[PDB]
Amino acid sequence: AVGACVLCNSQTSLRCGACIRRPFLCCKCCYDHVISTSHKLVLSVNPYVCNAPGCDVTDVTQLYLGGMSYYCKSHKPPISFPLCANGQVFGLYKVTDFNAIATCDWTNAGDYILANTCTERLKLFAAETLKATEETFKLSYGIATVREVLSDRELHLSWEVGKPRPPLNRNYVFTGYQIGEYTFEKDAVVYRGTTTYKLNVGDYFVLTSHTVMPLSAPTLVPQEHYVRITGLYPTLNISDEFSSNVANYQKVGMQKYSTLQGPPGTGKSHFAIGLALYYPSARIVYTACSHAAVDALCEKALKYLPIDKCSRIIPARARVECFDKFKVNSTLEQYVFCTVNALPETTADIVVFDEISMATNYDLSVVNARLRAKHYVYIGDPAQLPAPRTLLTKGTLEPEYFNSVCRLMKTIGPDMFLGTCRRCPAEIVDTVSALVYDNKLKAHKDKSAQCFKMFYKGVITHDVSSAINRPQIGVVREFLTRNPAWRKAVFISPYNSQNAVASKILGLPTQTVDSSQGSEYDYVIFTQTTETAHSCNVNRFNVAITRAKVGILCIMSDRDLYDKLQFTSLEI
Ligand SMILES: c1csc(-c2ncc[nH]2)c1
Ligand SMILES: [Zn+2]
Ligand SMILES: [Zn+2]
Ligand SMILES: [Zn+2]
């Protein structure tokens, strides 16, 4: 119970007992909090509650100090001061934005906008409160048990009736019972158990409500501009291969932190691994939110960096399969590849945080608390997909509000920008350059002449809320008979249910737009499925079409995005 205020750091014994995170509030700030919100419980050494037997008065405005104890107006002695008077709540060592974070339910977009526009301490308070809320909301869902086993990939479950049923897709990871993490995709549902055990009739699962740990470090450390490279030792031999990034690697050694906007296939991984070849003595920790992003950095380092100084830090409880080729869990190796949630207590010359659009302010803070570094490099693209905000249902979260790093890239601009897309045919590069990069993304490849668009709204059917468009899958089928070279294509769509129908009918490997991020394929077949805000989202549209290296077929529902696609229009 000893500490400083979240709004001005003025020392106090006062905490708000109504806040889900019980923040320390000073005498003036605690008052301006209780008088403006429904939050009336004030904690300190002892809570502010009437001491008189059986008295349930807990509002600090209806309370007074009688001698050494606290009492309401019905119990107070003649010599008693009200706890609320003269803009202060009585406490030791004797704003609008804080109120809104402390009381919001996180279902509105404006709640996240504010969690990013506020001061740095209010950013941590909001990040902590939001994560606590998201975890307490996980309990609100019911417990599901095994009813029977059809085969090695199909089953049926008993639900606790009453308490809501959480959504069935590859976005909700259950913790079976201690039979490893599990995922679900739709009466015969499919079980994607991260561990191979015969799911006995009687075992049950639950959404892992991993507890929220208070935030110490800021989302972004204070910026420092240096006039010479600091604590890093460059080379004058750096291979031609990484010479396009030499002026940027120098900017990296001349700032405490630096931002890199890298559109799809502009060489983000190349930049990250090449930074190690530019400062060859530097100890570098490569971090990202997902195991897939960490693994993609593992793959690029396997080609250019010495395997003996590499290590893939894997969490004790192995969820799904990750990197196998590096010396596992060696914390003192020069190059360490580990996810934000598995980051051990250590220091580094440079920390590279890749896929920055997927990072939350909580993630930004964790990295700053578990890693003390000379240089921090954030690589990503605010034009790509952000972390799914489960509680958010009203309003769309704009890129300047994804996190503090995205916020900078969208207002002041990124420190560095990779302007040449080497992956996509010019039809795709030109489309997304106009759509999300203000015509600053350039095509390295020529037009492949294999980028097609078909405007076909079809028939939207719903598998609960996840959507299906069978006429769009049927249009893909007719196209595949006439274009057998498209037999190697990946079927992408914004919905899992669409992907499941297309997996059975077309037989193509499947992918949601969100899971396609970071990956590339020669041929991509995208069916838009619906014209919802989800399927029409420009960051999602951008990721979807920028997966193709050679050609893409887009079956569109929205006329806007269809007309924007600089592709050859097909017929039927
Ligand atoms: C629902 C809310 S906005 C929306 C939309 N935006 C673009 C196309 N459809 C659908
Ligand atoms: Zn409060
Ligand atoms: Zn204060
Ligand atoms: Zn009383």
Swiss-Prot record:
* LRR repeat ranges per the UniProt record: 208-228
Chain ranges of the (+)RNA virus helicase ATP-binding domain? 237-418
Q: Which residues bind Zn(2+) 12?
A: C16, C19, H33, H39
- For the ligand (a ribonucleoside 5'-triphosphate), the binding residues are G262, P263, P264, G265, T266, G267, K268, S269
Which of this chain's residues are annotated to bind Zn(2+) 13? C50, C55, C72, H75
> Where found in the cell?
Host endoplasmic reticulum-Golgi intermediate compartment
Start and end residues of each (+)RNA virus helicase C-terminal domain? 419-572
Source taxon at top rank: Viruses
Reactions it catalyzes: ATP + H2O = ADP + phosphate + H(+)
Query: Outcome of altering D240Y?
Result: In strain: Epsilon/B.1.427/B.1.429
Binding-site residues, Zn(2+) 11: C5, C8, C26, C29
Q: What is the effect of changing P77L?
A: In strain: Delta/B.1.617.2
User: Where in this chain does the record put each CV ZBD domain?
Assistant: 1-105
Q: What is its biological role? A: Plays a role in viral RNA synthesis. Multi-functional protein with a zinc-binding domain in N-terminus displaying RNA and DNA duplex-unwinding activities with 5' to 3' polarity. Activity of helicase is dependent on magnesium. Binds to host TBK1 and inhibits TBK1 phosphorylation; the interaction with TBK1 decreases IRF3 phosphorylation, which leads to reduced IFN-beta production.
State the oligomer form and interacting partners. Interacts with nsp8 to form the replication-transcription complex (RTC): nsp12, nsp7, two subunits of nsp8, and up to two subunits of nsp13. Interacts with host TBK1; this interaction inhibits TBK1 phosphorylation and decreases by 75% IRF3 phosphorylation, which leads to reduced IFN-beta production.
Protein name, per record: Helicase nsp13
Source organism per entry reads Severe acute respiratory syndrome coronavirus 2
Q: Which gene encodes it?
A: rep
Instruction: Identify the segment of the full-length protein shown.
Output: 5325 to 5916 of 7096
